[PDB]
């Protein structure tokens, strides 16, 4: 699909149109969940290595939160680019084929006849 799309730079993480997308914010709930995941990574690693799970390994917890937020922001930018280019290819195909995707002029509820199914 995206491997076969034309104009695809091979093995490119962020192309030039991902800069044309709006970048995600740091207050976003996926990055908030990944900061919670980095803190839970430090808590689980300190619990297995038999540490005080809050007091000990604060630098490793800080690297876990920072590296999790960094990888999640970069992957969130790439996945936002992928869903945006899926929307662009679909809207371009809709603009290319209106005779293959016609507008559905739905009739009104006075005009149609829904069958009435009474329960008693």
């Amino acid at each position: 699909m995206m491997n076969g799309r034309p104009g695809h730079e091979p093995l490119k993480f962020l192309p030039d149109e991902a800069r044309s997308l709006p970048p995600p914010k740091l207050n976003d709930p996926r990055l908030v969940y990944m900061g919670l995941l980095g803190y839970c990574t430090g808590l689980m690693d300190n619990m297995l290595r038999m540490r005080p799970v809050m007091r000990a390994g604060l630098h490793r917890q800080l690297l876990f939160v920072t590296s999790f937020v960094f990888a999640g922001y970069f992957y969130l930018k790439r996945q936002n680019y992928l869903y945006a280019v899926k929307d662009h290819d679909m809207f371009g195909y809709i603009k290319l084929h209106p005779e293959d995707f016609p507008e559905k002029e739905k009739k009104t509820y006075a005009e149609i006849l829904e069958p009435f199914h009474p329960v008693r």
């Binding site: 076969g4 034309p6 091979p10 093995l11």
Partner: protein
Amino acid sequence: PFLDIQKKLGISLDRHFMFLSAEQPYKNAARCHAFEKEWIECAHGIGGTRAK
């Protein structure tokens, strides 16, 4: 490819003997070389389902 590292680095390492109509030692053309050349240049980025 899956990891497209040959297209990423721009260097052909296994790609220069991929079909029958690739380049040959001392310029000796294979049988059906013109047929393979016209088949690839008629399937030149058309896609598989439209090209078949």
